[PDB]
């Protein structure tokens, strides 16, 4: 019997993209899927087969170059709280006459447990990044409730007030980091201390789907190796870095696709070498199916798309989460890590050439690609959700 499954997410490609393979699988299985997101993402969600439930957000739009995310967790958590306050009633109104049978929610979609409780329906977290392992709060002490110093006190005070007002008695830190049930969009082997993560998490590897909505990328079709350079969907405002990349690839016998993000006008790079094409935004997944190397910020989505395609990486992280991902890449022998303020043209060139030609890296990428093929993906995730629906 078809059920109504609602996805709650936040307006960022790194949070939305992994969910879409699960949407596509659920729709294929005959379920009615609705998807709470902003207008910016409605067309993409529609293409996946879901009905958008559009809400108004105060979060920085990845399409608006006049605003950006903060780099620090403290500020970001404040933003997600204020957004939760404002989004909660919008979703309650939208679903008033048509409550879902189950909610699948992103790590930052804090209205979900509130409404799951209110509506007495199951709610399952979908994590696009690594989850809390044994001792997590010591490594990431911003999640510890102290009740920048004043800022964290103010945040926890306000978070506790929100939760209590809306009938959630879960202690604040637990609310933030310990979901009752979570489907994780990476394999356990990549997860930091994955062996210490308990059975309320299931690691299914990347869950991205058919991204035909983005269309195809047409390569030169000359047999030359293709390098993708892309720093994700958020922390991309790095003109000097992109100029350094141009110098790095000049005279390289490779085709290069350079994605510069929404903050940088491609014309501000000037004349680019003849082997380079520059865009603000590219069909990254399609290009990664054709690529021989990838200069990446090591966001989890980008990491998992590359690994699914056995593409070696040179990681230049922006925020701490990405540094942790880059360290895992190094530890697993899948690429190189060059910290942001240690980048030069020569270093980038040497790294790309080294990772793309290393037979040991190639062997390890082949192994990891197979692990991902075995992890279960969107099929396993949909199975888990259907098991919950069978009871609910």
* Cα(336)–Cα(209) distance, integer angstroms: 27
324-342 burial: b if 16+ Cβ within 10 Å, else e: bbbebbeebebbbbbeeee
State which of positions 256-275 bind ligand UDP (CB under 6 A).
Answer: 259
**Subset of residues 187 to 246 that bind ligand ZIO, contact rule: CB under 6 A:** 234
Which of 6, 9, 44, 129 binds ligand ZIO (CB under 6 A)? It is 129
Selected binder of ligand UDP within 127, 175, 305, 361 (CB under 6 A): 305
The stretch among 294-302, 327-335, 342-350, 363-371 that binds ligand UDP (CB under 6 A) is 294-302
Q: Which of 76, 332, 353, 354 binds ligand ZIO (CB under 6 A)?
A: 76
Confirm or reject binding of residue 300 to ligand UDP (CB under 6 A): yes
Residues 291 and 214: their CA atoms lie apart, in Å, by 17
Nearest alpha carbon to residue 14 among 130, 113, 129: 129
Q: Which residue among 42, 166, 281, 369 contacts ligand UDP (CB under 6 A)?
A: 281
Instruction: Verify binding: residue 132, ligand ZIO, rule CB under 6 A.
Output: yes
Name the segment binding ligand UDP (CB under 6 A); options: 110-118, 147-155, 186-194, 230-238. Answer: 230-238
Which tokens go with 44? 């993409």
HSE-up (13 A, CA, CB side) for residue 355 = 27
Q: How far apart, in whole angstroms, are the C-alpha atoms of residue 114 and residue 120?
A: 10
C-alpha to C-alpha distance for 223 and 221, rounded to whole angstroms: 6
Instruction: Give the residue, chosen from 114, 226, 324, 381, that forms a contact with ligand ZIO under the rule CB under 6 A.
Output: 324
234 binds ligand UDP (CB under 6 A): yes
Site for ligand ZIO in 13-32 (CB under 6 A): 14-15
Residue 11 · residue 36 · CB < 8 Å: no
Instruction: Tell me the helices (H) and strands (E) count for the chain, helix number first.
Output: 14, 13
Q: Is 282 annotated as a binding residue?
A: yes
| Residue 13 partner contact from ligand UDP, ligand ZIO, none using kind-dependent CB cut-offs of 5 to 8 Å | ligand UDP
Structure tokens at 375: 């992890």
Interaction between residue 146 and ligand ZIO (CB under 6 A): no
Q: CB-based contacts of 223: which residues, under 8 Å, 6+ apart?
A: none
By CB under 6 A, residue 319 contacts ligand ZIO: yes
Q: Which of 84, 186, 285, 352 binds ligand UDP (CB under 6 A)?
A: 285
Min dist CB 323 to ligand ZIO, Å, is 8
User: How many other β-carbons are positioned within 10 Å of the β-carbon of residue 45?
Assistant: 26
Backbone angles phi, psi at 314, to 5 degrees: -115, 110
Rounded CA-CA distance 231/225 in Å is 20
Residue selected from 6, 19, 24, 302 as contacting ligand UDP according to rule CB under 6 A:
302
Tell me which of 57, 68, 73, 214 binds ligand ZIO, using CB under 6 A: 73
Site for ligand UDP contains 282 (CB under 6 A): yes
- CA dihedral in degrees (322, 258, 246, 324; nearest 10)? 10
Cα distance between residue 228 and residue 39, in whole Å: 29
Closest CA to 101 of 77, 120, 127: 120
Residue 49 touching ligand UDP (CB under 6 A): no
Count of residues interacting with ligand UDP (CB under 6 A) = 18
Residues present in the chain in total: 392
Residue nearest to ligand ZIO (CB): 320
Q: Which stretch binds ligand UDP (CB under 6 A): 24-32, 73-81, 293-301, 351-359?
A: 293-301
- Beta carbons of 262 and 253 less than 8 angstroms apart: no
* Rounded to 5°, angle at Cα 385 from 381 and 389: 165
| 82 near ligand ZIO, rule: CB under 6 A | no
Do the annotations mark residue 214 as ligand-binding? yes
Residue 259 contact, options ligand UDP, ligand ZIO, none, Cβ 5-8 Å cut-off depending on partner type: ligand UDP
Could you tell me the two tokens for 381? Answer: 């995730």
- In 3D space, the residue among 23, 68, 61, 67 whose CA is nearest the CA of residue 44 turns out to be 23
| Binding region for ligand UDP (CB under 6 A) | 12-14, 17, 230, 232-234, 259, 281-282, 284-285, 299-302, 305
Which spans of this chain sit near ligand ZIO (rule: CB under 6 A)?
12, 14-15, 69-70, 73, 76-77, 80, 107-108, 129-132, 140, 143, 176-177, 234, 319-321, 324
Residues flagged as binding site: 17, 214, 233, 259, 281-282, 297, 301-302, 305
């Amino acid at each position: 019997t078809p059920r109504h499954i609602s996805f709650f997410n936040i307006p960022g490609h790194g949070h939305v993209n992994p969910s879409l393979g699960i949407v596509q699988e659920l729709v294929a299985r005959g379920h009615r899927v609705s998807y709470a997101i902003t207008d910016e993402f409605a067309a993409q969600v529609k293409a996946a087969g879901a009905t958008p439930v559009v809400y108004d957000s105060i979060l920085p739009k990845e399409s608006n170059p006049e605003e950006s995310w903060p780099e620090d967790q403290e500020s970001a958590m404040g933003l997600f709280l204020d957004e939760a306050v404002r989004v909660l009633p919008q979703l309650e109104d939208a679903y008033a006459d048509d409550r879902p049978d189950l909610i699948v929610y992103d790590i930052a979609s804090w209205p979900a447990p509130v409404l799951g409780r209110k509506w007495d329906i199951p709610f399952v977290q979908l994590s696009p990044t690594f989850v809390a392992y044994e001792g997590f709060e010591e490594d990431v002490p911003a999640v510890q409730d102290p009740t920048a110093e004043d800022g964290l006190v103010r945040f926890f005070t306000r978070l506790s007030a929100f939760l209590e007002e809306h009938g959630v008695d879960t202690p604040a830190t637990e609310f933030l980091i310990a979901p009752n049930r979570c489907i994780v969009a990476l394999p356990r082997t990549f997860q930091i201390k994955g062996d210490t993560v308990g059975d309320n998490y299931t690691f299914v590897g990347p869950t991205y789907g058919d991204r035909s909505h983005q269309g195809t990328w047409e390569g030169p079709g000359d047999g030359r190796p293709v390098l993708l350079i892309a720093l994700g969907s958020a922390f991309t405002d790095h003109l000097d870095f992109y100029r350094t990349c141009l110098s790095a690839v000049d005279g390289l016998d490779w085709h290069v696709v350079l994605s510069v993000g929404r903050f940088v006008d491609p014309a501000d790079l000037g004349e680019v070498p003849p082997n380079v094409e520059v865009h603000q935004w590219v069909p990254q997944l399609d290009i990664l199916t054709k690529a021989s190397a990838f200069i990446t910020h090591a966001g989890m989505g980008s990491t998992m798309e590359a690994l699914s395609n056995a593409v070696p990486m040179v990681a230049v992280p922006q925020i701490a989460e990405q540094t942790m991902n880059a360290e895992r890449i190094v530890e697993l022998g899948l690429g190189r890590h060059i910290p942001r303020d240690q980048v030069t043209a020569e270093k980038l060139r040497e790294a790309v050439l080294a990772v793309a030609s290393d037979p040991g890296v190639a062997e390890r990428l082949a192994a990891v690609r197979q692990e991902i093929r075995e992890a279960g993906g969107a099929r396993a995730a949909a199975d888990i959700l259907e098991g919950i629906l069978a009871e609910a």
